[PDB]
Amino acid sequence: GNKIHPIGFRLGITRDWESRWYAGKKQYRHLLLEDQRIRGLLEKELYSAGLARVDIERAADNVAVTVHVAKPGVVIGRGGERIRVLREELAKLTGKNVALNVQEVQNPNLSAPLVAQRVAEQIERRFAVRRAIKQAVQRVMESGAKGAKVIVSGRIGGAEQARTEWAAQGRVPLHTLRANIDYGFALARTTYGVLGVKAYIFLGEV
Amino acid sequence: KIRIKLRGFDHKTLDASAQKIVEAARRSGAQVSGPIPLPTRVRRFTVIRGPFKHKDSREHFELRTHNRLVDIINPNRKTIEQLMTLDLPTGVEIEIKT
Amino acid sequence: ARRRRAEVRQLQPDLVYGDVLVTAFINKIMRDGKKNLAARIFYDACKIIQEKTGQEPLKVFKQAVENVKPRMEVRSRRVGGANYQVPMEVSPRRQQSLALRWLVQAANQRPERRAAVRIAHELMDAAEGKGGAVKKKEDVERMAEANRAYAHYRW
Amino acid sequence: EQYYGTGRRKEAVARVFLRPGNGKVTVNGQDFNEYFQGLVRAVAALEPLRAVDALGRFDAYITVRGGGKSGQIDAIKLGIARALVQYNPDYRAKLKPLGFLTRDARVVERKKYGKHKARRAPQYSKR
Amino acid sequence: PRSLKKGVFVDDHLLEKVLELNAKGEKRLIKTWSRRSTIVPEMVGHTIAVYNGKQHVPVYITENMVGHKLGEFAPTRTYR
Amino acid sequence: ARKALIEKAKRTPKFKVRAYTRCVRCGRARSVYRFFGLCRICLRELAHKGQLPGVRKASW
Amino acid sequence: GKGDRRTRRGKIWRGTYGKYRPRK
Amino acid sequence: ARIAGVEIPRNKRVDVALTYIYGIGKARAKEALEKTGINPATRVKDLTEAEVVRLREYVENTWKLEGELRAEVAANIKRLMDIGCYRGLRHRRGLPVRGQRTRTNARTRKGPRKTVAGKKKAPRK
RNA sequence: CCGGGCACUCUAACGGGACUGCCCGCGAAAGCGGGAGGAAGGAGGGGACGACGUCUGGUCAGCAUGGCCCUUACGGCCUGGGCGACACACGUGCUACAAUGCCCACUACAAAGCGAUGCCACCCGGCAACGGGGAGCUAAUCGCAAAAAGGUGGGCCCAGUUCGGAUUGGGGUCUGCAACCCGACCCCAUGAAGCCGGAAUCGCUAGUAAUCGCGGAUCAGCCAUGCCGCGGUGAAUACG
Numbered sequence A: 001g002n003k004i005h006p007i008g009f010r011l012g013i014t015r016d017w018e019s020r021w022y023a024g025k026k027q028y029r030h031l032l033l034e035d036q037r038i039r040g041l042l043e044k045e046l047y048s049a050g051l052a053r054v055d056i057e058r059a060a061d062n063v064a065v066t067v068h069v070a071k072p073g074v075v076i077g078r079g080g081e082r083i084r085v086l087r088e089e090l091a092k093l094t095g096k097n098v099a100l101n102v103q104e105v106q107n108p109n110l111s112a113p114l115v116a117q118r119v120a121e122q123i124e125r126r127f128a129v130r131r132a133i134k135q136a137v138q139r140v141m142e143s144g145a146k147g148a149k150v151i152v153s154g155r156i157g158g159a160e161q162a163r164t165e166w167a168a169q170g171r172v173p174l175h176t177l178r179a180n181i182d183y184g185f186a187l188a189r190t191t192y193g194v195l196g197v198k199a200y201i202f203l204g205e206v
Numbered sequence B: 001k002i003r004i005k006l007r008g009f010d011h012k013t014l015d016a017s018a019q020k021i022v023e024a025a026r027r028s029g030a031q032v033s034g035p036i037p038l039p040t041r042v043r044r045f046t047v048i049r050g051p052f053k054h055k056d057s058r059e060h061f062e063l064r065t066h067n068r069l070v071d072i073i074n075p076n077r078k079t080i081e082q083l084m085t086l087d088l089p090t091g092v093e094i095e096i097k098t
Numbered sequence C: 001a002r003r004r005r006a007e008v009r010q011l012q013p014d015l016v017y018g019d020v021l022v023t024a025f026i027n028k029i030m031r032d033g034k035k036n037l038a039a040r041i042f043y044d045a046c047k048i049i050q051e052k053t054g055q056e057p058l059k060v061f062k063q064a065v066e067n068v069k070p071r072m073e074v075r076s077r078r079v080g081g082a083n084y085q086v087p088m089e090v091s092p093r094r095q096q097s098l099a100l101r102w103l104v105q106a107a108n109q110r111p112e113r114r115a116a117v118r119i120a121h122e123l124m125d126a127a128e129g130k131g132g133a134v135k136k137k138e139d140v141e142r143m144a145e146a147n148r149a150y151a152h153y154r155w
Numbered sequence D: 001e002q003y004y005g006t007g008r009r010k011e012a013v014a015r016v017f018l019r020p021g022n023g024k025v026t027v028n029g030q031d032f033n034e035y036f037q038g039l040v041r042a043v044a045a046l047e048p049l050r051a052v053d054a055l056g057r058f059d060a061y062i063t064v065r066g067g068g069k070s071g072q073i074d075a076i077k078l079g080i081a082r083a084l085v086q087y088n089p090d091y092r093a094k095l096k097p098l099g100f101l102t103r104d105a106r107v108v109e110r111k112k113y114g115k116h117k118a119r120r121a122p123q124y125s126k127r
Numbered sequence E: 001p002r003s004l005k006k007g008v009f010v011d012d013h014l015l016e017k018v019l020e021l022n023a024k025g026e027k028r029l030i031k032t033w034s035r036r037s038t039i040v041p042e043m044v045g046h047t048i049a050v051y052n053g054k055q056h057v058p059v060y061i062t063e064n065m066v067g068h069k070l071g072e073f074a075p076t077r078t079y080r
Numbered sequence F: 001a002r003k004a005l006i007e008k009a010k011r012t013p014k015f016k017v018r019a020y021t022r023c024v025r026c027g028r029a030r031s032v033y034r035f036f037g038l039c040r041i042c043l044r045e046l047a048h049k050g051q052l053p054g055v056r057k058a059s060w
Numbered sequence G: 001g002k003g004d005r006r007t008r009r010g011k012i013w014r015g016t017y018g019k020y021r022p023r024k
Numbered sequence H: 001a002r003i004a005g006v007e008i009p010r011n012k013r014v015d016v017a018l019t020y021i022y023g024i025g026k027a028r029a030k031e032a033l034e035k036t037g038i039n040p041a042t043r044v045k046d047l048t049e050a051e052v053v054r055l056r057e058y059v060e061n062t063w064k065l066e067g068e069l070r071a072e073v074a075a076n077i078k079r080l081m082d083i084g085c086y087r088g089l090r091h092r093r094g095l096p097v098r099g100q101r102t103r104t105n106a107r108t109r110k111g112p113r114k115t116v117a118g119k120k121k122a123p124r125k
Numbered sequence I: 001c002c003g004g005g006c007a008c009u010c011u012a013a014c015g016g017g018a019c020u021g022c023c024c025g026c027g028a029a030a031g032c033g034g035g036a037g038g039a040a041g042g043a044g045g046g047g048a049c050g051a052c053g054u055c056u057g058g059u060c061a062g063c064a065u066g067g068c069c070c071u072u073a074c075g076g077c078c079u080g081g082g083c084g085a086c087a088c089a090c091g092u093g094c095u096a097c098a099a100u101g102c103c104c105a106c107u108a109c110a111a112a113g114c115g116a117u118g119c120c121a122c123c124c125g126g127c128a129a130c131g132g133g134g135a136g137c138u139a140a141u142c143g144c145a146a147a148a149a150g151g152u153g154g155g156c157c158c159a160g161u162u163c164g165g166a167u168u169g170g171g172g173u174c175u176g177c178a179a180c181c182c183g184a185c186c187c188c189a190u191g192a193a194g195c196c197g198g199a200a201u202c203g204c205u206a207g208u209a210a211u212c213g214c215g216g217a218u219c220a221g222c223c224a225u226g227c228c229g230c231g232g233u234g235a236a237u238a239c240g
């Protein structure tokens, strides 16, 4: 049980925060619990949209929130009717009065969280783990990326003995503090139990 | 004599921010006292790495807060024009007391 | 020390005699890094060597060290079963370390209530060839040369 | 007219101002022998002077803040060493070989976790 | 070397319930979980039964034991 | 950390000394930091994600 | 020493003030 | 000079010396000397018959000392010991009274360790 | 302190600097030795950072989760007790056995932190904890804060002591609805063991060990002699 989170490790560089807003002492804890409330619903809802990140900027009673998706449609809605439901369901949580932008994911095949969830799902549907994994690494590796790697937890195939599956291609330097490796974790509830899924994608460097 | 005090988490989101405030008003008031730094206050959070035991795991987390000042003496309407409503950064938050 | 041959830390000379050997002795008196009290004691002592002795303290000191340096010492060693105490020379370096250490030790073994005195009197006694310091020194040589049979285990 | 040299040691800063004169020293006001009232080491600070037969030829006003009177004694020693160069830059030839123009970089070592004092590791019994 | 300050504390479960019995003289028993309370004169003569945390032990309150605190007369743990 | 034992939010301390922090995410009452409302664990989990604004990894 | 609660050090050690380590 | 109940502190500083009395500590020392206006540094032998009377009288009559005191203290303990007072039971049982741990460290109140047989393999380390 | 002045210290942001780059020596090369300059070197000093895997390692008691079990209850509320028990055994520590020391007074250098009912200036009542009053601070501009070891002067005079503070009696402060069980603090009295520790055993290679005090998190208060961190003074030794 070693190695740090590849993101948290690189936060100073090659990776910005998910919530970039000043605050302090009396507020910070309140102004943060909120962010989690926010993210809470978005992930509980926008699942089929393909969640990947939830930036949350601030300045004062005019929050940001910039959900990133693979299928920006599912988010918005018909003509923009859903972005009405949510955007409203939002203030029924934070009187704060906040926006709700939506950026599209340029190739969900380079989004560790996505590749992860991608695999997490297949596994839930009962696909061959090792296959799903190799495939995933291929997709990711086959559409850009200077390196990728996926890891599935254990009880592969519902086996009584928890195992751990691999798969990796090209440089994926977890040690190099400047790599720019996207990390993504996906759960996977199952008849037999939870099985975590980890996706690592390497892009450029400097 | 409008004393501005800028605080931010990013030492760039300020040098950028507080620097705008300098170039702007430098054409409608005095000449600004230049963005003077000011000591940073760091908050350390030393936490045990894993749950249950392992007293010597740890790993350190700090939340450093940075400050900037500036100071514009000789306030002249246009100063409060080039500044009043032309900011940009989001990871910043000001407090001014002329 | 598996790799290098750990070189000796070179000490800054005395703030009065500019003699390094003195600093060394002062460092052996020091405890808990209270190097001032340590320096004092040795100087107060040097002035006690001036009164009760018409000689220059610095020379009494060096004379002492000299008589307290063992030239032969016994070092244990496992040789076919038993641990025979092999007698052997003593490096110039080790001679000092031991001499100074022994002085301070025997000095703090004396009775006189005052630290600075025990050092003063110990040094003198050492110069004359008497005192707890020189005891150990002569005891060591005696130990060797009394085991000079196993000296063919030269080492 | 005047000469300068800073000087820092183990977290101490000493403003050293030499000035052709008697050879006295005003450390933070008090006399050299007054601030360092009874410290067998003090004598050190002025060593860079005796280095080139100064002292009884110069004079020194010194501001010292930070650390301990021991660290200050070394900062000041470096100050008097630097300043003594802005004056005559030719002093290096003899002032440096002594190492007075170096900035002892030995500082306290961070206190690492798991250990009692950065290194002093806790002890065990019947391990 | 005990100390409360200014305002000798006594829960008024038994207080206003002990003095009410002072009107008709005394009574025959009491029982409070307030071992937290100090003992005042009005308690003297009486017989309050304190709680072990399991039992209600009968404690005859005499003068010699006023200033104390009931619980000090109802042992908790069981040893030897 | 049983729903039942998260009556901490009940205010009603009857006396304000019965009040107690509790994790605002897992209920981990045991080592909850104030400045975050989070326990030593969650604080570490989130710091790794970047969801703790300007909370980088220390080192010196 | 550091342990005598009624001395200078005893007070300093226990980080307190009293008749033995007054405020000034 | 002999002062309180069989008290004879001599040849030392008067303060120090008064300390040798049951109810007198380094505190009452400087005071009894303070009030009675006597140098504390004077060697008990070098004292004056006049000072030894003001001391002998001021002290003996101002504080409850010696035997009479041990009588009180003993009397106290006996009391909280007669009444079901827990604190009193701690005296009977001979265990520490001021609520300390009695699983380890209570030797000052228990006496010498009274070792018994025990259970080995069960890392009692 | 005042005007004034950014030089200096510093504050924090950026830029420079080290690369065996230059000189001599050996080498095929990598590089080893030596020397100059330099604040600094041959990885300049300390962190973050832990490979494929191992131990059926640790945690379902942080959280998550398969399966099993309980549902007037293996759920829930409350008051009180318990987690603080002791004939004993061990681990990690604190304080100490003293004169390179202890006590009183006077006087001097630090860093990193924290502060809204919060830090608490200063003044008063109290031996004191602390209480009353009340300024500033929203905190490089006010407070915690006194650094301690240290320097100077005095006392102690080798004694279980002006060492050492356990234990116990009494008085009292403070937080808190509430301090019997079971808080910390103050003052008086008490003043224990301990005179340097058997077999055995632990740490640390330099600003390290050793020693001295300072801050923080948790937190009403606090059992902190713990933990994380700060600076002061500052060694011995390494043949092998």
Ligand SMILES: [Zn+2]
Pocket: F023, F024, F025, F026, F027, F028, F038, F039, F040, F041, F042, F043
């Ligand atoms: Zn939590």
